[PDB]
């Protein structure tokens, strides 16, 4: 990144870290730093079951690490044509830098376009904690009629889910329970449509095919709306 953006990152570190000035003076220009291996983009035998491939995809995403630096290294414009977002995903594998949740969703799409028997659809969450609202997103997946997820989060239980849930409702309710355990109340779930496996597609990702107001719907209608969305996607 260019020199001005680099200084901005370190200036931001100075404010958000207790001894922020100390952190930069220990790291900047240091000659003894660890050499970080560039993670190997996983490739797949045709004999490998898709769930096993997904474990390798998630492992790769995890190796990049969650970006806690305070500076997002890849700008994601969500209305860009898919082909542009896939060019960016390729650059993420080249630059091999830490990522956050939305970048992980784009990467997960890029790395599963070779899996036409897998459908991929974004799931975003709006939660409420300590008077304030928080946004999160994962890549929902469907293999052989069972639901799972790929993604990246600060918490282990708000990203990867093996494709074992027999309904979309059960997948989303698992996220809701995980949020509950860290004292977040789930307010909205926004679910997209299946994403094209063509990395040169000019169509946009559809991020908000269903926008579900959890409290206004109530338990049973929340579940029915999730099952309606799952039907919309299968057809």
């Amino acid at each position: 990144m260019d020199e001005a953006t680099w200084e901005r990152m370190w200036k931001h570190v100075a404010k958000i870290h207790p001894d922020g000035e100390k952190v930069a003076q220990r790291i900047r220009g240091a000659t003894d730093l660890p050499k970080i291996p560039i993670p190997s983009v996983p490739t797949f035998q045709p004999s490998t079951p898709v769930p096993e491939r997904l474990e390798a995809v998630q492992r790769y995403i995890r190796e990049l690490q969650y970006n806690h630096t305070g500076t997002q290294f890849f700008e994601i414009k969500k209305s860009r044509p898919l082909t542009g977002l896939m060019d960016l995903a390729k650059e993420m594998t080249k630059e091999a830098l830490p990522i956050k949740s939305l970048e992980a969703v784009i990467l997960g799409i890029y790395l599963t376009n070779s899996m036409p028997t897998l459908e991929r659809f974004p799931i975003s969450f709006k939660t409420y904690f300590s008077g304030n609202y928080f946004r999160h997103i994962v890549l929902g997946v469907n293999f052989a009629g069972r639901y799972g997820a790929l993604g990246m989060s600060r918490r282990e239980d708000l990203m990867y889910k093996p494709p074992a849930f027999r309904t979309l409702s059960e997948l989303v309710l698992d996220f809701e329970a995980a949020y509950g355990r860290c004292w977040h109340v789930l307010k909205k779930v926004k679910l997209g449509q299946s994403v094209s496996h063509d990395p040169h597609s000019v169509e946009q990702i559809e991020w908000k095919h269903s926008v579900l107001d959890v409290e206004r719907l109530g338990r049973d209608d929340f579940r029915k709306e999730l099952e309606r969305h799952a039907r919309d996607m299968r057809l």
């Binding site: 969450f125 609202y133 928080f134 946004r135 999160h136 989060s153």
Partner: peptide
């Protein structure tokens, strides 16, 4: 939209 990144 509303709220910070989780």
């Amino acid at each position: 939209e509303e709220g910070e990144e989780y």
